[PDB]
Amino acid sequence: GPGHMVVKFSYMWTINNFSFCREEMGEVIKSSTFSSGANDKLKWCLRVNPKGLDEESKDYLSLYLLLVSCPKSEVRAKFKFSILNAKGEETKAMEAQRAYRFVQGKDWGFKKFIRRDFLLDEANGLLPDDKLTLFCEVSVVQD
Template sequence: MKNKSQWCLYIYHNGKNEESKEYVPVYLILLNTYEAKDLVGKITLTNSCGFREFVKKDFLIDESNSLLMGDKLTILCEAEITDLKYGNHSNQETSINIMIPQSKISLNYGIMFESSIFTVCSINIGTTEI
């Protein structure tokens, strides 16, 4: 896409590593950029922002918590991009707000399961198989 930044939302349903295996970590990754130089969030990195302990898996799949509505998880993601020219990290005058499109992860999983390429594919959360 010309003149637009491209983003990807990574959700690790079995944790990203041994330390986060009981959690569902979520990371917003800046794939490429037109003018954006940095992502500012709780964690400031060159091209990503995330939460290693976004939500505990047990808490997420517990129906009494009502986080999975119709077996779907909705994540609202807001990000602010700032232009940090010449290494000036204190310049807030050029900040802009952007809207991140709604995740299409459930649609992508549906396409994956319908494809003959992934005939032996399943998603497991704890002891539950989707």
């Protein structure tokens, strides 16, 4: 039966002067809004907790996709997060295994996205020049 093409798009977010303390960064960091295009009526953004906000995730950085604005009832979207290293390569990817149902104001993400001590280990190259660069790929689907 006829349907709609999968709508794929991406967003790169650079968080400068990344630090591991509440002062300097605050508990919730928010990205600018993004979408697939100009004619797109949906508005998305990312939100990071540099330290997870519960006991289970306190040793991790958390990362979420938030649907800011949508006119339609709901949106089904599959999403994938990764960290870009200094070569521009994706690393430490974490991906939804199915599409999740989004409504205006709903977020979906990973409270245990990456361990803080792994991020801070300079051997891992994920904070070159104290900059965390995150890359989000989204597929808006009918499924």
